[PDB]
Each structure stands twice: as C-alpha cells, then as structure tokens.
Write a protein that binds this ligand. Structure first.
Ligand SMILES: Nc1ncnc2c1ncn2[C@@H]1O[C@H](COP(=O)(O)OP(=O)(O)O)[C@@H](O)[C@H]1O
Ligand SMILES: Nc1ncnc2c1ncn2[C@@H]1O[C@H](COP(=O)(O)OP(=O)(O)O)[C@@H](O)[C@H]1O
Ligand SMILES: [Mg+2]
Ligand SMILES: [Mg+2]
Lengths: 567, 110, 225, 228
C-alpha cells in the first residue's frame, strides 16, 4: 500500500517503528513528522495512538532504506473513543498507519466536556483539527507564555483574551463576566482591544495611601540602612495622619493602623518628620513647641499640630529625634516633588476613593469593560516594581475578601480576575535584589495562594530564564512560541513536566505564530498553530529609518525647549 | 511527644534542618525535576513515576512503610473546603453587578 | 558535473551529506565551508535550503575519499521565494549542490521590505550577498556592539553611522534628520566624520546647575570621609 | 581641568543653548555630535556622561508631550553611542558610577518610546550590567576573546549560532555576528570597510624613543605650566 510500517520494539513509554515500503511520498511529508500521530494496531477498532518523538531515514548503497520512527504511546482508542494513558501495551509487531482526522479529533474532544472546551488554536500539522483546552483548568492554573521577540507572544496573549471575551452563554446580550488586567509596557493592546478601558500615567491615579506597610517603606525608607527610629517615626506619622482625616465611626477609627487602607496626606507626613528632626526637650524631658495658637507639649493629643509647617521649637536640650531624620526628610520630598510620580504622589491622589481605585482597576466604573489595559510605558522603572506590586496586591486581597463575603453566604467567589504580566521577568527576577522584592512577593501570593481566591497570572515574558523558579513552577499551563536562547531553553526544560521529544529541538525551529500548549488544560502537549488575530496588537514604535530619511526638521526644536520650560 | 507534619509544596525551598529530620515521607505528583531529585536522593527508581502520578496518588517511604511504594490515598468522604473556581463557567454568565460597599468595609477593618 | 553530493541521512533537524565526486576543488574551499548554504532538491523549482554545521574528509589507501557534510535544514525555497521552515522533510537520497546567489540573497532580502532595508555589511562567506537589517527595527531597539580591542568595533560604529547619515528620502538636498551623539573617549571619531560638530573640554560648556543632587554631591564632596 | 563644568561660561550659558550644543541644533547643524570627553578628568567623567545622558532623555521625554497635543507626524529620533560602556555602566553598585548607571539604564528601559535610543560599544562586555545589556535587542558581536566575555555574551544573546564558543575568538578582522529583531537569522557578516576610517591621534612611543634626546622641548613645557 501507500505506507507499510510496523512496530519492531516497545519500551515502557517508547515505540520504535520501522517504515518498510513508503510508496506514497506525501505520507512522509506531513503525516510522519515529529509530533504527528500514528495508529498502532492489527485491527480497525481497538488501537493505540502515538506521538512521534524522533525519526531517522538511513539510505546506503545496496541494502534497503532504513526509515526508523521513535514514537511514544499517548493513549488508547476504542470504537471512536480515545482513552489517555501509556499503560496499555502493544505486543510487537503491530501495523502502523497515520491516524485519520477523526482519531486526532477524538484525542482532544474526549478528555474535555462540550461546555469546558476553550478553542483558540488548531494543530500545526493538521489544520482541520482544532485543539481545545480545559478552559477551567486553562485559567485557574496560571499560564506562562514564553518566546523570543518576533515569535508572536503578544498575538497569542491577545487571541486568548479575545476568545475569553467573545465567548458567552446563550440567552443574553452584552458584556460577559470575564475580568482581565494587562500590564502593558510596550503599549500594544490598544490596537488589539479598541472597546476597552486603558489607563496610562496621564489618566490613571494610583493613591499612595493604598500602599501597604511593606510597599510604603520600600518606596520611602532605605532597606539597607534599617533605621528603626526612622521606621518608627514613619509609622507613627502615617497612622496619626490617617486618624485626623477619617470622617466616620470612632470604633473604626481606633482600629486604623499603619497598614490599614485609609487616606493620609504625605506633605503633612513630611512636615511631621521634619518637625521631629528639630525637637527640643525641656528639663522634664518633654518636647515643647509654639504654633500660632500658643505653646503646647508634644503628646498624643497635640501630635497632630506638627503636621503644619508653622511650628517653632521651644526648649533647652536636643530632642529625642533631633538630627536623626534629616537624610529621611530630604529623600522623602525628593520623590514627592518629582513630576514623574504625579500619578502616584500628586494632587490627584487626594480626590480619589478606595472604591474609585477598584472601580477603575477592574473596569467597574461608568464605562465597563472585560479588559483593563494598564499602559505602564510612561511609569518610571524605579516605581514599576512598586506600582505592579500595589495593583497585584489590590487584586489579590480583593480576591481574598470577595471569597470571605461569599463564605458567609455559602457561595463561590463570583468574579474571577486574570492579570497578564507582559515582560514578567522585570517584575519578578531570579535575582534576590531588594529593588524588585515587593513585586516578587506580590506575584508570589497570586501564584501560590491566588488559585483559591479568583486571582491568577498570565506570565508573558520574552526571557523566562530571568523569572524566578518559585513563580515559574506555579504556572501549570505553559505556551512556547519560539525560544532561541540556549539558556532560555535549558531553563524551561528544567521546569517542564515530562514532554520529552516535543521541546528538545522543536522550540528553535518553530514557525511564527505556532506554539506548544501543555499542562492539565490540554490532553497531550502538542504543537499547535495559534489562530490569526483579525484585530492584532500593534505597538506604535518610532520607525527610526523613515524619520531619519526625511528632511532635517527645524520647527520642532523650539517647541520642545519652551514646553520643557513651561512644565 | 511533640512531632510535626510538614505539609509543604516543593521540597527545594524548605529549610534543610527540618526536612532532613523528617523520616516518613509522602510525595504526591511533583512536576519540577529539582523537586524530583531531592526525593530521589532520599531513597537509597520509583521516583521516575513522580511526575506522571495521577491525581490523589502518593509515594510513601521511610521506616513506617516496609517498601517505598506508589499508593492511592483514600478518598475524603468529608473533604476539606478546597473548591476549585471554574474560570470558564463563571466567565460565561452576565456581568454580575457586585457592589463594592461590603467588601472594602472589612478590608478597611482588617 | 562539478560536485556530486547527496543526502544519506535525515534527522528532524540534521542532514548528512556525502560528497561522492569533487571535480572542481574551488567548490570545496568557498562553497562547502562551515557556515555555507546548501540547497537540497531533486529539481530546480522547489528546494530545501540547509546551512552546514560540520564536515569531515577521510582518505584511505584503498577506499575512495569519504567527504561527509553535516547540514541543518534552516529553510525552504519555492520559485525564488524563501520560507523559513521547521522539519520540512527531504526524503533521502537528494542531490546537493552549493546554493545559488539568488537563493542566499532571498534568505536575507525577503524578510525585510525594500523601504526598511539598511545595509552596512555583507556575508562573510559570500561577499556578493548583502546582509540587510530592518533599519526601522535596528535603531529604536538598542544596539550592543561587543568585541575585543583591535577587533574593529570603532570601525563598525563609524560605518553604521556613516550609512545612517548619507541616506535620504531623495526628495530634498541637504542634511537628513539623523541625530547621533557619540561619547567619544579615545578621540577617534573626528576623522570618521569630518563634517560633524566635535566638542572637547575647551569647547564644551556644561552647566553645573543642570546637575541633580546626586551628581552635585560627587562633584564637590568627598565620600571616603 | 574643571573649567568646562565650573568656569565662568557655565554660569552665563542658558538652558536652551546647552541642548543646541549637545544635539547640534545651534548655528551649524550636524547629524552627528561627537563629545570628546578624553580630556575630562575620570573623577567627573561619569558625572558629565550622566548629565548629558539625562539631558537627551528628557529632551525625548518632553518630545512626546507635543506629539500627543499637536498630533504632528514629525519627530526627532536620537541615538546615543557609548564607547566603553562598561565603565559608564558597570556591574558594580559602587557610588562612583551609579549616576552614569542610572542615566544609561533610564534610556535602556524607557527611552524606546521617547526617541532616545542607545548604542553600547564596549571591549569588556562582562562588566556592563545585565539590566542594561539585556535591554538591547540587536547585538553586533565582533571577535570576543576573553572567556569571561564569551560566557557573558552567550547567555544574553537572543539566539545562537552553530558552535558559537569557538566562533567568537576566531572571528577575522571586521567579522561580526548580528542577532536580534532587525536581522532574520544570526549570520556571520563582513562590515563594510570605512573609506574615511576613525583614526585616533596616538603617540608612537617607539618611534619618538629612537630619535635623539630632545632638548628644546623640555623648557617650553615648564614655562607654559608656570604661566598657566
Ligand atoms: N498566529 C499567527 N499566525 C501568523 N503570524 C503571527 C501569528 N502570531 C503572531 N504572528 C506574527 O508574529 C509577529 C511577532 O508578533 P508577536 O509574537 O506579538 O511579538 P512578541 O513575541 O515580541 O510579542 C507579528 O508581526 C505577527 O504578524
Ligand atoms: N570591516 C573591516 N574590514 C577591514 N578592516 C577593518 C574592519 N574593521 C576594522 N578594521 C581594521 O581593524 C583595526 C581595528 O580597529 P577597530 O576595530 O576600529 O578598534 P577597536 O575594535 O579596538 O575599537 C582598524 O585599524 C581597522 O583598520
Ligand atoms: Mg510583546
Ligand atoms: Mg575603539
């Protein structure tokens, strides 16, 4: 016939197959490649199916052509139903044919129910078979999409999220329940999602008072110095400043502390610390001051008077914290006065509300969208770790507190939230440096605990080898577009469960747009082709050649200098 | 009379001084070869079935058991409250109008 | 025939080529190098383009010369248009000849549009093959030129910037819109760009008040005490 | 020696003509501005590099404020060339180079969207910090000869070539290895020979040493030192 192949030797998880005739040559081109499917039986009703790991076509002078195929049994097909598992044994010899379209269809359409299938790709070797994943297990367990630049990582990320949005239950019209947050550094998802809410530096206002205790001392204190007097004066200023701006029930006011999410004004906090750099005790060891209303003694009731600048110290000796906080103050106003941090430490953070920050972060405000794109292109890199950690922790503890409401009502956590981390190695590196510590811990709690609270990850990173092992291993679903760095491939090989022969040489040689889906979301790790984005991502990069190719511009330079002076 | 049960996730990050003191060892499915190699080293070739372990299966080793063997732990008739969130099925419904009042009250409380 | 090479073994990403007859020696020196490109086909229409990775030539007293070439199928060509491919199968035996100039050119030229092509170098094993880069994408993403002293990285920097300066949209006469700043420390780029603006210590006027607080501390204070 | 940064000229110069000097938008336009920083003392060299690198970056940062307000098609892209980038941006976190490190790393991380891009030209790549070297996408790897620089580059290269370990010390003169977004495959290239080559005025020590013992030149060095 066209193909005459049979199994010559078996192993616990390996079939070695000898192709004997190969009359029809296009059988070898598309049906005998690495990752293709073979039907291994002597009948046409019960069979094993096998992925192709390796092949070798030896040809020599006089003897026959030695086409040897190394295959691994992926499961068992009985009467059109596919059953996963390599436990079933084929006693050699067994006649080997390429699997028909219905068998490859039954591989992916049997392990997943008709309502749990999430299709966003088709098989690369056979276009006519779609490859669904268990969309519950696809999204509940965290997703890692890796690959080099130009391999199609952002197109794969975008195409997953559009299929998450466009899929709906029947009987209703309008926006669905899916909530996806994207950390966009290269500003690519505006062109992918036109009907979505995007928040850049000029638009998004992140309140600084929503930063927790760990995030506040990273942004303001020095971890390396570790000064407990500077630490104590920071907490006792912010805790007191949250008390004086609370307008509510006194019982809630007592439980307000340094980590509690309440509004405080950072300018008065600097003034309190700057005043406490100039304390002067009397002979009774009490600090005495004088504002416009008269002299007073520094105690619990009158410590709020130090928030104003117009206080003069009145005493004989040096105070308790006199001269111990000057390097604290100068760095404290260095970050407040900086114009790059107006979105976080500016005047706009005074007029926003804890509700308004949540309503803007997951697009629950006046305009509602499934996709919230956080354009952090303009965010300076020293606060990129702070801002990502603030938003990630604001979604995790929302995901925690959403569940604990529903546990009281004996219900499930209603809304599940996905966060997409583009270029995730910058937030969460393998390096244990303190400058990316707060974003590392924020992604850690989502990776290790967020599965039970409705907060998950989409780690989309160009360099997986610059992501930490303790967060990369939590991503059960793994997508491999095209990986070319040897350290990058040796990294993912060390973090991958099994899948021998589908990564060893396949990842460098993959085409653009085709990937490798694996995990418990899929029946077997297969090379699939991610379907094309009709509304693709498009970062508006500066096309350096065409702008250099044209005339030397002269009108623009005068406008740049005077705008710099105006701002 | 005070012993410990170390219900960790990955052995590669737990302190050596506690994890070496443990003698009875139960290993479920372990997808990280670094985690596999630590479990392999404790044995004096059944570790190669650690990643292909089915759900609920375990490998018990130590002086409590006669031989290190792959076992199926008994199903919990009264299971602990660990419910997996169906991401697809929740996302299929309407945009549920959830009021933020009650959630941020307790977030501000604790 | 000049050279009679033939594929004898096929792997998923590896090709073994046996050179049976080598009448022209010059094909071996230039066209059968370590990084040279081979076309693998039984016809002149559709070919499998493969780069070489290793070779071995064996001579023994009685037997014939065993010239073996180990190649890797980097791509595929169809009617002069190159497709970068993965595990496209060539059933052995297949006649192997050195790749044509138009085939090697189509590997580098077809991936970049003609407007975005930026050429500053040619292929090392084929000087007739110009190697363009996506000059749209070459500059906006950062460049890192690394080598040893005396490897020529000052020449490579100079040649790239000369190619970025003389190029224009052709609709005008005068200076283009390139803006390149060189932190020249070895006093060497004065010769490469004679019509440029050079600023040494005697001509530069850097205001001290534009320094930030961190820079101003190092200019004046001592940090050891 | 610090007259260029602390002289009477630095007080009278205004903010606008500083950028006309660094970008060459002054009286005489130029595409290429060469900053001869050889006579700059090494104690302040990181200060002057960071001052200029910051000044170009906020020129590009405030470039985009007009283009979002006016929506004009025109733009000024700027490339910065850092010859010997390993001393301006070292791996060490010592206080002496963290000003020039922070200025370069701001350009390497945010400068893509503002039109301020950078070219790193270093003979010792292993001293450049990984948080700056990995931000580059196109890598022109010439003959790399030290094993520490070979191992550093091979990790942070976006791709690989066949037998790259012996390829790097065996590259001939002008031979390079370009990988990244701009090129299609990693190819071994021959860079075009410079018709007008970059030449540095170097002191031929052996050539002047074989000459006669000079006598007149010693007194003219002292009198200018005495008068200035
Ligand atoms: N499924 C696909 N089919 C065909 N081409 C694709 C597909 N996905 C991406 N591409 C192409 O790959 C290129 C790289 O895009 P992308 O993968 O988003 O880059 P990155 O990997 O840097 O995110 C795009 O220009 C796009 O045209
Ligand atoms: N592409 C090339 N082709 C031929 N010769 C070159 C090439 N590039 C550099 N050279 C020569 O090699 C020498 C090395 O100088 P260069 O590479 O510029 O120094 P460095 O690498 O130390 O910056 C130069 O004198 C130049 O004449
Ligand atoms: Mg991308
Ligand atoms: Mg040089």
């Amino acid at each position: 016939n066209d193909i005459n192949a049979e199994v010559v030797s078996v192993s616990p998880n390996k079939l070695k197959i000898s192709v004997d005739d190969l009359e029809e040559f296009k059988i070898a081109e598309e049906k005998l490649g690495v990752g293709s499917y073979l039907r291994v039986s002597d009948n046409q009703d019960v069979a094993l199916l096998a992925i192709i790991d390796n092949f070798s076509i030896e040809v020599k002078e006089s003897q026959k052509q030695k086409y040897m195929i190394e295959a691994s049994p992926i499961g068992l097909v009985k009467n059109g139903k596919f059953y996963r598992g390599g436990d079933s044994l084929a006693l050699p010899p067994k006649k080997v044919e390429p699997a028909k379209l219905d068998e490859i269809i039954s591989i992916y359409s049997d392990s997943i129910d008709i309502n749990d299938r999430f299709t966003f790709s088709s098989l690369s070797l056979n276009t006519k078979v779609s490859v669904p994943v268990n969309g519950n297990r696809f999204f509940n367990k965290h997703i890692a999409i890796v690959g080099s630049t130009g391999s199609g990582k952002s197109h794969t990320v975008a195409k997953i999220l559009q299929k998450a949005v466009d899929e709906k239950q029947e009987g209703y019209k309008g926006l669905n329940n899916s909530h996806i947050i994207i950390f966009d550094i290269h500003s690519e998802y505006e062109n992918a999602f036109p009907n979505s809410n995007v928040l850049n530096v000029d638009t998004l206002t992140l309140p600084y008072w929503l930063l927790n205790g760990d995030e506040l001392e990273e942004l303001f204190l020095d971890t390396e110095a570790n000064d407990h007097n500077q630490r104590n004066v920071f907490r006792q200023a912010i805790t007191l400043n949250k008390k004086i701006h609370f307008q509510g029930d006194p019982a809630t006011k007592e439980i307000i502390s340094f980590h509690s999410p309440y509004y405080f004004d950072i300018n008065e906090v600097i003034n309190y610390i700057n005043n406490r750099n100039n304390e002067r005790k009397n002979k009774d060891n009490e600090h005495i001051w004088s504002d416009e209303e008269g002299n007073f003694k520094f105690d619990n009731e009158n410590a709020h008077r130090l928030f104003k600048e117009n206080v003069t110290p009145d005493g004989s000796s040096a105070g308790a914290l006199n001269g111990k906080l000057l390097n604290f103050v100068d760095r404290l106003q260095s970050k407040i006065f900086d114009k790059r941090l107006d979105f976080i430490l500016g005047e706009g953070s005074k007029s926003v509300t804890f509700k308004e920050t949540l309503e803007t972060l997951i697009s629950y405000g006046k305009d509602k969208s499934n996709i919230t794109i956080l354009d952090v292109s303009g965010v300076p890199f020293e606060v990129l770790s702070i801002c990502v950690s603030l938003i990630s922790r604001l979604i995790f503890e929302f995901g925690y507190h959403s569940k604990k409401i529903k546990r009281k009502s004996n219900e499930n956590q209603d809304i599940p939230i996905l966060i997409v981390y583009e270029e995730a190695h910058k937030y969460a590196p393998k390096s244990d440096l303190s400058k990316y510590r707060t974003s590392k811990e924020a992604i850690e709690r989502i990776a290790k605990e967020g599965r039970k609270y409705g907060v998950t990850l989409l780690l989309a990173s160009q360099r997986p080898s610059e992501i930490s092992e303790t967060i990369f291993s939590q991503c059960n679903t793994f997508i491999s577009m095209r990986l070319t760095n040897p350290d990058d491939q040796n990294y993912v090989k060390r973090l991958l469960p099994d899948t021998v022969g589908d990564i060893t040489n396949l990842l460098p040689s993959l085409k653009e747009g085709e990937a490798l889906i694996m995990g418990d979301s899929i029946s077997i790790p297969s090379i699939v082709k991610i379907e094309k984005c009709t509304i693709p991502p498009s970062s508006i990069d500066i096309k350096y050649l065409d702008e250099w190719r044209k005339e030397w511009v002269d009108s623009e330079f005068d406008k740049i200098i005077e705008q710099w002076s105006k701002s």
